[PDB]
Amino acid sequence: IVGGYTCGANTVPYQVSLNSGYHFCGGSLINSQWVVSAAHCYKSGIQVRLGEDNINVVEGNEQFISASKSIVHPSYNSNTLNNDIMLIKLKSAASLNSRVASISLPTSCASAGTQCLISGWGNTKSSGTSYPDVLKCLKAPILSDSSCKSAYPGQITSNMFCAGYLEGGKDSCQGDSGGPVVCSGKLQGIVSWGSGCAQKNKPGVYTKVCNYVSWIKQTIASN
């Protein structure tokens, strides 16, 4: 996250870290045995880490659980990142309390102007790299579809939305992919892509979760 603030330990209780020997993507806990992330974060041998604040120090609230299966969206296109969403089922259910809790899926799609909370352990610099060990947060608004398509002509589909600042300085970044965009207590987006990070007129682009609720619910119900 570039230009964000330190969230504070376990203040984002649905945030997970996907680990394959190291943190490589974020994710959101949607129930005690399922995590939603970005399809471009897919790989085999994923261990889901819940209750994390400092990903390099075991502080006491962590739950490390392996994935039993991953399901990438049937229409995911890795060249355009359209339908960039995946589901991960945990080998055992996590123990939910105040520091590890699931986030609700939305009943309605959020509108431009909505302020949301984006979080992750991604790079905090726009030029250069500095990866933080504790969770960073950013409050940002969803932008109009007009501003979004104008910033990325020919690349935005109906399954994506932009959120951020056209002025730059604040954005999600590499290492934040797969994480949550929560607006009014509902998971409305998944950190998906951007052109660099925090650059002027290049806001972050997110998977529009409201368009996948039926698929998520039907998938969980049968697996």
Ligand X SMILES: NC(=[NH2+])c1ccc2nc(-c3ccccc3O)[nH]c2c1
Torsion, CA 11, CA 34, CA 24, CA 46, rounded to 10 = 140
Going by C-alpha positions, the residue among 119, 89, 106, 147 that lies closest to residue 4 is 119
Q: Which amino acid is at 41?
A: C
Sign of the torsion formed by the C-alpha atoms of 87, 90, 91 and 92: negative
Residue 92, CA distances (Å) to 19, 113, 158 in order? 17, 38, 35
**Is 73 among the catalytic positions?**
no
For ligand X, give the closer residue by CB, 94 or 182.
Answer: 182
Interface region with Ca ion, contact rule CB under 5 A, candidates 57-65, 85-93, 97-105, 212-220: 57-65
The answer to whether 144 is a known catalytic residue is no
3-state helix, strand, coil in the chain (%, to 5): 10, 35, 55
Q: Is 172 in the site for ligand X (CB under 6 A)?
A: yes
The CB-of-91 to ligand X minimum distance in angstroms stands at 25
Residue bearing tokens 């610099």:
125
Report the partner that residue 176 touches, choosing among ligand X, Ca ion, none (CB closer than 5 to 8 A by kind). Answer: ligand X
User: Of the two residues 19 and 207, which places its CB atom closer to Ca ion in the complex?
Assistant: 19
CB of 23 to Ca ion, least distance (A): 10
174 labelled ligand-binding = yes
CB of 201 to ligand X, least distance (A): 12
How many angstroms separate the CA atoms of 145 and 160, rounded?
9
Residues from 191 through 210 that contact ligand X (CB under 6 A): 191, 193-194, 197, 204
Residue 90, binding choice from Ca ion, ligand X, none, Cβ under 5 to 8 Å by partner class: none
Closest separation between CB of residue 114 and Ca ion, Å?
31
Q: Does 39 bind ligand X (CB under 6 A)?
A: no
Catalytic residue among 17, 23, 37, 40: 40
Burial class (CB in 10 A: 0-12, 13-18, 19+), 167: exposed
Residue 180, helix vs strand vs coil: strand
Binding residues for Ca(2+): 52, 54, 57, 62
Q: Which residues of this protein are in contact with Ca ion, per CB under 5 A?
A: 52, 54, 57, 59
Catalytic (active-site) positions: 40, 84, 177
